[PDB]
Amino acid sequence: HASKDPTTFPLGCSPDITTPKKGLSMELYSYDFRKKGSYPCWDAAYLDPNYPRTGYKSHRLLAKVDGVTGNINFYYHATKGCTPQLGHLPASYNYPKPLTMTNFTMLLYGYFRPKVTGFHTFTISADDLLFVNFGAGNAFDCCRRDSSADHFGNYQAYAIWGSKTAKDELTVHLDAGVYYPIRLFYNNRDYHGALSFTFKTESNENTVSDFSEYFFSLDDTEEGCPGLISY
Amino acid sequence: HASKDPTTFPLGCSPDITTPKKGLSMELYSYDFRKKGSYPCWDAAYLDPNYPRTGYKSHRLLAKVDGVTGNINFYYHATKGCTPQLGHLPASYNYPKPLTMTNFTMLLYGYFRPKVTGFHTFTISADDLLFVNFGAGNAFDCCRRDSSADHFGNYQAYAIWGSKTAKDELTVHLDAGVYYPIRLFYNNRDYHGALSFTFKTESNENTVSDFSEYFFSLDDTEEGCPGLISY
Numbered sequence: 001h002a003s004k005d006p007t008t009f010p011l012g013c014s015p016d017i018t019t020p021k022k023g024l025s026m027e028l029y030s031y032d033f034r035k036k037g038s039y040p041c042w043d044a045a046y047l048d049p050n051y052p053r054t055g056y057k058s059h060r061l062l063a064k065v066d067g068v069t070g071n072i073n074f075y076y077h078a079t080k081g082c083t084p085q086l087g088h089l090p091a092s093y094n095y096p097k098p099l100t101m102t103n104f105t106m107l108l109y110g111y112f113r114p115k116v117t118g119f120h121t122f123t124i125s126a127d128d129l130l131f132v133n134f135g136a137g138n139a140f141d142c143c144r145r146d147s148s149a150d151h152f153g154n155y156q157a158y159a160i161w162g163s164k165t166a167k168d169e170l171t172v173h174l175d176a177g178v179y180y181p182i183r184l185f186y187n188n189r190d191y192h193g194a195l196s197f198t199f200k201t202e203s204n205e206n207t208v209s210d211f212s213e214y215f216f217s218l219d220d221t222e223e224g225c226p227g228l229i230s231y
Numbered sequence: 232h233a234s235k236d237p238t239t240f241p242l243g244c245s246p247d248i249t250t251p252k253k254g255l256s257m258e259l260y261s262y263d264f265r266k267k268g269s270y271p272c273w274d275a276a277y278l279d280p281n282y283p284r285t286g287y288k289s290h291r292l293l294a295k296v297d298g299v300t301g302n303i304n305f306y307y308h309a310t311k312g313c314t315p316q317l318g319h320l321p322a323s324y325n326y327p328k329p330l331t332m333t334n335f336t337m338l339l340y341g342y343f344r345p346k347v348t349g350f351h352t353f354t355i356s357a358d359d360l361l362f363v364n365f366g367a368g369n370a371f372d373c374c375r376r377d378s379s380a381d382h383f384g385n386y387q388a389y390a391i392w393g394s395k396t397a398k399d400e401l402t403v404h405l406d407a408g409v410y411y412p413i414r415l416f417y418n419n420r421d422y423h424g425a426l427s428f429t430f431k432t433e434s435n436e437n438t439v440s441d442f443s444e445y446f447f448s449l450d451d452t453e454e455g456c457p458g459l460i461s462y
């Protein structure tokens with residue numbers, strides 16, 4: 001160089017006849033540096049309170065893909081600060097092309113399906129930013145993302161590199177086989193990048209990092225697909 | 232180098248027998264630079280999404296004063312970046328002591344009492360940050376700040392120096408003589424500072440910058456003081 005509030009007992013969704021499709025949807029957007037000579041060289045727009053809501057959409061759209069699943073963690077090691085440098089996302093992201101891994105924004109959305117009924121703790125870390133919404137309402141409404149995408153509530157967990165919250169966790173009680181809306185919003189402002197998203201349950205001692213049997217996409221429907229299990 | 236959502240028709244409050252006290256309450260907090268040699272030298276904590284909610288309270292408390300009113304605008308011109316430099320707030324702030332005007336955080340809260348029934352447009356600008364909540368619920372509950380202070384909603388207006396939103400405005404319909412909860416959250420991260428808060432009404436052509444007959448403080452009460460005028 002559902003209510004929008006985060007909760008420990010989130011609401012979930014009950015899909016009907018159509019088989020859920022594997023994986024999350026992802027959108028990729030540009031995130032330019034500031035003009036040469038600026039101090040610092042990186043743009044602080046990523047921290048504007050509405051950047052994850054409306055601001056990101058004013059940047060150049062790079063891609064929109066389906067079927068993102070597996071292990072979505074990555075570490076991108078840059079060689080120079082203040083410089084756009086190319087790299088590739090892991091194959092799990094279904095995006096073959098190079099992108100500026102030093103400086104970009106990424107949105108992932110869809111549903112998390114548990115295998116365990118009970119408490120789950122999701123652990124996150126990021127360079128630079130990962131904001132997580134989770135649950136109907138807090139993320140978006142069941143099979144009604146089209147009317148609720150931009151209306152997510154306060155984050156269930158968030159991580160900001162360099163901050164007092166560089167890693168974070170969310171503990172929620174979930175029901176096996178129910179589909180929970182999830183939104184992951186990521187940014188790299190400069191230099192190295194990293195995303196880590198894993199979970200554990202009170203059940204066993206394994207950390208889950210491969211979401212192949214956990215992330216799904218559901219079609220929106222006129223009436224929605226609110227969870228039919230809770231009572 | 233009331234609902235928490237922002238609205239155009241905010242809810243207000245009806246004080247009982249006790250005469251409203253002149254002015255807002257203010258709290259002042261430290262905001263340190265990063266360690267010498269850091270790039271950039273200023274701390275980005277001010278932009279953490281919970282900094283205006285919980286994070287500011289972890290910093291050193293400098294002052295808590297009553298009776299802030301008059302013209303609250305200021306421009307502080309620093310002579311060196313990355314350096315704590317002393318200055319004084321305007322006399323309107325009722326705080327005589329020097330403080331590090333280059334790097335500090337300030338919270339103001341109380342009620343705005345209009346003189347006009349009709350649309351008001353408040354205009355703000357700041358170096359570095361000014362976040363405004365306005366209306367019962369969005370700011371805090373009528374004569375119930377003690378149970379609602381930390382639960383303000385999405386900002387009615389906000390300004391961030393260097394951003395695509397360096398000035399902002401809020402247009403709201405208000406009733407004369409009703410008391411609207413208001414919260415102003417300010418930060419200077421480095422170097423120069425500035426705060427501007429003014430309004431106009433559709434009625435006349437004058438810009439109001441002297442809040443002497445507009446800002447008030449109301450005691451909290453067990454039952455609250457919800458507005459009795461709307462119907």
Ligand SMILES: OC[C@H]1O[C@@H](O[C@H]2[C@H](O)[C@@H](O)[C@H](O)O[C@@H]2CO)[C@H](O)[C@@H](O)[C@H]1O
Pocket residue numbers: 001040042081127128161189190191192193269270271
């Ligand atoms: O360390 C990861 C972190 O790097 C920041 O760049 C820093 C750099 O680490 C530091 O050595 C230098 O002095 O200042 C740089 C810019 O603030 C990235 O900005 C940050 O996004 C992370 O990737």
Ligand SMILES: OC[C@H]1O[C@@H](O[C@H]2[C@H](O)[C@@H](O)[C@H](O)O[C@@H]2CO)[C@H](O)[C@@H](O)[C@H]1O
Pocket residue numbers: 038039040232271273312358359392420421422423424
């Ligand atoms: O201009 C007000 C603005 O100054 C920032 O400091 C800048 C400075 O303006 C710029 O000339 C220099 O190259 O980089 C500095 C640090 O980013 C303050 O950081 C900012 O808070 C405002 O006060």
Ligand SMILES: [Ca+2]
Pocket residue numbers: 127128188189190191192193
């Ligand atoms: Ca980075």
Ligand SMILES: [Ca+2]
Pocket residue numbers: 358359419420421422423424
């Ligand atoms: Ca400044």
Ligand SMILES: [Cl-]
Pocket residue numbers: 002136137141142224225226227
């Ligand atoms: Cl729903």
Ligand SMILES: [Cl-]
Pocket residue numbers: 078080081082083084085102190191192
């Ligand atoms: Cl870089």
Ligand SMILES: [Cl-]
Pocket residue numbers: 233367368372373455456457458
């Ligand atoms: Cl109220």
Ligand SMILES: [Cl-]
Pocket residue numbers: 309311312313314315316333421422423
């Ligand atoms: Cl300074």
Ligand code: NA
Pocket residue numbers: 063064065066
């Ligand atoms: Na596509």
Ligand code: NA
Pocket residue numbers: 294295296297
């Ligand atoms: Na005092």
